[PDB]
Write a protein that binds this ligand. Sequence first.
Ligand code: ZN
Ligand code: ZN
Lengths: 94, 370, 73
Amino acid sequence: TLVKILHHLEEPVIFIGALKTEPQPDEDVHCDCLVAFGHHGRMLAIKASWDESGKLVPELREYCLPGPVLCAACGGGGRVYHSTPSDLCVVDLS
Amino acid sequence: MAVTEASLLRQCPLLLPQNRSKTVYEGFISAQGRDFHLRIVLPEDLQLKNARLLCSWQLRTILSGYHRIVQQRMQHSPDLMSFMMELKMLLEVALKNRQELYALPPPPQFYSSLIEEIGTLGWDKLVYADTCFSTIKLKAEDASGREHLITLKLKAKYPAESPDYFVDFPVPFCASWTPQSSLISIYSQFLAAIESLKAFWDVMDEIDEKTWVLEPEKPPRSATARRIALGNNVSINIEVDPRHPTMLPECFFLGADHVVKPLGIKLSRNIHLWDPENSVLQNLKDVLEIDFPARAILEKSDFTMDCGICYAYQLDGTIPDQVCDNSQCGQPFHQICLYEWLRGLLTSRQSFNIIFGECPYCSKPITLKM
Amino acid sequence: IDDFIGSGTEQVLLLFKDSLNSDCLTSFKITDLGKINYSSENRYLVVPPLETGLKVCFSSFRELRQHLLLKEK
Ligand SMILES: [Zn+2]
Ligand SMILES: [Zn+2]
């Protein structure tokens, strides 16, 4: 010199990243999925479908994982390591 | 009702007209024990040709991949009544397609009752439980002292509906499920099936030990067929009836046309001396007047017992089966490989399911029946 | 009290009396009060699924509380 709204989780945002689901070494991996976390432990996931109508449709999930999530990161091969004040847990999207 | 005074109340109880002019509805819409938030603005007049429809972001997620259907339905649908009818029926479709989002176990009668019932069984029985508590796998022992497992896959309601039972043995298991039936009930059914087959298990285990079982390898419990080796590079396959195992099975031989003739002849002449009070092996040995080899592995380890076309043992299940009617070749082959060869030759001619023509190695007449 | 194993989780170390030997940290007892226990499977089969059941049930509980506040609004 415009800004677009995607989902609006009701609770605050903690981590945003991206994953390689269906991982069938290189640093730049062409990421298939998109990930966000809430504090209260709503997870969001997005994927490309191209299924049933012969056209691309956005596949949303919206999970409710336990505990106030405090932080997270992404491990190679559609894995997310996230942490609640009880334990450090993992989620496998692959 | 007919009119959308009472019919609207009866079919969207949870929609409260906010304005005097019934123009702004708000509230909830019901589907599969689940209310979703919704605020459905009409114009000054009752026209859905032009109408806003706003949602909860939870609802937008579940109506992704139908936005066009909804927009079409708004424009084409006469009244609001029928609109809501169509919208609900479409939510039933959306959720029932994404059925993987569901099956939440109730806290009061699930996690407690299943432990009570497993206590009723015995904890030596259970071998696996899933962290969703969805899958369990349970164990039982024969009079023989053999382990047979059973997987259940269980829903949000275990005791209401039947659990999905996956069990090894070949005949279909039937489980009389009531809401009053339980893990001990269906376990007793499994033991009943076991003790009924007991003879079958004993016949096939007796086979696996005391003869060279060839064309199942690491056999399942479902398997009724048993390609036994005898001599070298001739075999007999054997499909046995579970209900009457000791009874004669459907039986036939692969191998050399000059080797197999006398075995068929001897079987025909001795088959009356079949007796279902002996064992399978104890009848075959004295019917066929022979003994078996117990895994001739050490001596003929790398003798080239392969196709002699592709030079492989195990071509996608396939075993070297088809041989030469010749003392000097005796060369085994595969069906697939020997067809693909013989199909080409100018020498070869085909009858109904038969192909005549030359053994690759020795150029003598060899016959293939598909 | 600390993680001497290198599991991540804390353990308790207990040192018994010096009457045994004039030597430091002889006669120890290391324990988690769960599974880890050092010193000088039907049981161990059903706890993780039951804990996951508790966590799922806890998530549902909290979800319904949220659902209920919405209806009040
Ligand atoms: Zn030949
Ligand atoms: Zn071959």
